[PDB]
Symmetry: C3
Subunit: 390 residues, 3 copies
């Protein structure tokens, strides 16, 4: 993890206007966590000296969660407010205003809307930045559609000249496919200086953090650009199309990891698995299944098809078919479905059965108890090896 | 829209033998409309002077719908019958036989089996055709598998020489990937003349409309070929594999448009949305959902997973989960599912609840009324704020 | 089919350690058959003189099924045990130990974990091998990720020099994308000789069957390498990611074949169809449907959405919607669903109805009998044209 005293600025003060939502962009969720939660989790895991989230637009709606996140990650996370919305450059300034004017450690700048950014990418960025002893290193990548992204300008020797933002890009610059990831590692002194030379002149009368690269190029300073070949790692979310695209990509990776760890997943494209979910060896997951929240599946289970489980605990060798359930537990070797509905507080004992058109709410159903079909069981406590219906 | 007096021939008189169906090809449906309906809709929206659908094989089965379509589009749509099946050239002839022998406006020829063809493509074709003052302009494109399509023959100066049909293509011509879209814009005089010189000689002893290009090339006439880079726009349906491929592509576009307009769609690949469907801001759609016919969803709803709604009206902030419903309405803030079945004539009031294993037919269920579970409600009128079961 | 006296060795004696399962790799299932069953089926259909499956790791768990398979394919299938696990070369040796020391016919070597290998690929391999009068012909192909595969080494004249296994490959050899399929056709004498010269020296101290190619190259012998452009045909399964990838690919092909034969499949990506399944003309299959085992669907049916049928027989013009069923039959023009559960032994007569939240077990329900909703019917015999509930 991080060298230290590394200080990380997380930039989350812009309007995600293109989301077309009344909920703030970085709060939109993905695989069981908001984009912001994703970022904060990867960052925390490296343990910077400082960690400073910059708020702005809708800050009163986001702050709580940062605090939630701090206590969850057992770490202190500072919040810096952006006075007015004068751009990303200004935004980084507020961020720094959270550090001692004598702070020396390098500074990593990142955004709140790149949910797939992982540890290795961040560790690589630091190591590269230290290796080439750069002033700024900037993570780039190449996309089939650079739309919306800052473009990377390189002379024939691949030396980086600057970054032009989509708004300020010329029709020929727009053709450039190498994009600015928006993940930086700055030497702090270099950084502060470069910020003091920003011009609101062009082209959204804001202070572009991206302008810092040309400035540092200019003033005889060392400027490195590290290209991330796996783009998903560093892609950003601006609209709900991108959100879904990234969701699917991350799901792909979650499922795949479960498969290599011994879980048969019949149709990955339609099996949705949240990041906290655990699944046991030789379990089989059939199509149209979502496993959400803190759902746990033991080994040798059969789950699905068409099963939705949120925060459900499932024992070994259980059968969970066409079941809609949440906040419940299902015992070893138990059989559930098809067409079964588990409401919060259902606890079904080992080898128990809940058959078709059965609904359970707030009930404990003992070991080996069967509820064959067409029956509701609410707020009940049913002993072991009974039968029930209707 | 169209310049006028533009006359459009829609060619729908061939057997879609490769569909392997007893239903006529152009009648097969896609995203809530038949291929023919799709075409007629895009064409109508430009408002040609004349609009002439050519029937032939199975014409008694298709005509009604053209008439349905005419009255639906508030427009007069003529039908021309093909006497015998002597090819596309002949077919265009019958089409013209619906125009005054003194008709002057340009003539656009199109087919009934290119369901994704949109306004811009057609407007571009006319503008190009007028710009270059062509005799014929023909829409082309490039496919990974040109199979079945007419091939575009170009000399080294990209001048178009002719179009060779798949049947008459040589093994080396078959390698050509640029295909004939089958969308033409003809200067009428040029057209009539070129048709009078068609030879049934080769290679299905028919009169190929495609042969017109070589003829006009030949007789010192101006021949343009406009390439449509977005192939889906101009792809044709010959078999059910192609139908499904295009269905999926159009769905992709429908969902995407909803996403950019503010709707969260968790898994686009498994969310099917018909073209007339409306969806409100910040609504969330979970996987395995179809929204069909004239289904309307308000804002801030939660729909799915595994939900199928056809011609259902849903208010704001409603919850519609694992529900199979048609021709019904669901009030603001109402909760439905999981495992709920709505038969035609269900009208559920605002804040009403229909829980698991509940079926409603032809019933009005008042505001705030709950039907918790395992209950059938038929032909009933239930007042406000009641409870029901079983 | 095969020339004869062709003898085929099927190699299934290695640990599929990367499956991370307690079930032997070649036993993992795909589209209604285990990988091994797939291979044996394609091989049998060519009717070699001899057919010899080599077992080893977990052989007591696999043998039964080979015997099951032999009697199923009405053919004698020999099993050869590998004494110790000394590699693929050794493995082929045991295989040969099942043949007469005077056996003359050519020998095809294949593995148990290439479930998509089809007749044409195998027939081509023999014809090529005989044509070029090769000593060994080896099926190759090119993958985007050669990981795990033997690499093909070719000099500038595309002459094949050898095959280097992933373990023994150098970082530059690892870049080679052309892989060894692991499907061989050997002239027997040449083969036996080449095996007697194998060195356990490198790099997993085993006897690599792949080393045979370099040996035969070396000793002035004719060595051919036939490249299979359709990789899926010849891809192998080492982990559950690959299993799912191949499953999906084979499903793609099964569905597509049904589509071209006249079946509308709305969403192929979510329609799963086992290889024995039959479906009738103009039937429509809606999303989230699996058709498993020996399920038969007549013509003009409507199946799905969200329907799972295993070994179910369905008549013409039936409706089967959101139904979970197995080992049952459903009559012509019958209507089933939504939310219907058919347990083994359900036989529903023509024009019968089983509505929502209905479960049937071990029952015969006569012609035109309705069970509207919310009803269980077990072990019953219900006459024609009755009504039932509840």
């Amino acid at each position: 993890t991080f060298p230290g005293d590394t200080a990380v600025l997380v930039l989350a003060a812009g309007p995600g206007t293109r989301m077309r939502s009344d909920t703030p962009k970085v709060l939109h969720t993905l695989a069981g966590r908001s984009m912001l939660s994703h970022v904060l989790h990867a960052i925390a895991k490296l343990a910077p000296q400082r960690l400073i989230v910059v708020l702005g637009h809708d800050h009163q709606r986001i702050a709580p969660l940062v605090g939630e996140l701090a206590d969850t990650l057992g770490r202190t996370i500072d919040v810096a407010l952006q006075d007015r919305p004068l751009g990303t450059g200004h935004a980084v300034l507020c961020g720094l205003s959270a550090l001692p004017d004598d702070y020396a450690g390098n500074v990593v700048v990142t955004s709140g809307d790149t949910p797939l950014l992982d540890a290795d990418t961040l560790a690589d960025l630091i190591a590269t930045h230290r290796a080439v002893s750069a002033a700024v290193t900037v993570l780039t990548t190449t996309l089939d559609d650079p739309f919306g992204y800052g473009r990377i300008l390189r002379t024939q020797d691949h030396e980086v000249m600057a970054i032009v933002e989509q708004t300020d890009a010329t029709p020929s610059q727009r053709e450039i496919r190498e994009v600015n990831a928006g993940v930086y590692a700055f030497d702090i002194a270099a950084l502060r200086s470069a910020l003091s030379r920003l011009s609101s002149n062009n082209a959204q009368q804001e202070l572009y953090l991206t302008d810092v690269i040309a400035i540092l190029r200019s003033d005889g300073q060392t400027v490195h650009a590290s290209h991330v070949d796996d783009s998903a790692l560093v892609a950003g979310v601006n609209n709900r199309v991108q959100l879904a695209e990234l969701a699917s990509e991350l799901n792909r990776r979650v499922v795949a990891a479960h498969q290599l760890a011994g879980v048969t997943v019949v149709d990955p494209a339609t099996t949705w698995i949240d990041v906290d979910v655990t699944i046991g060896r030789d379990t089989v997951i059939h199509p149209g299944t979502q496993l959400l929240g803190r759902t746990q599946i033991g080994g040798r289970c059969v789950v699905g098809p068409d099963t939705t489980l949120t925060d459900v605990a499932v024992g070994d060798g259980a059968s969970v078919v066409r079941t809609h359930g949440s906040s419940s537990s299902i015992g070893d070797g138990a059989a559930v479905g098809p067409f079964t509905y588990l409401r919060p507080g259902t606890a079904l004992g080992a080898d128990g059965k809940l058959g078709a058109f059965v609904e359970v709410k707030n009930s404990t159903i003992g070991t080996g108890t069967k509820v064959p079909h067409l029956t509701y069981v609410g707020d009940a406590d049913i002993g072991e090896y009974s039968n029930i219906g209707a």
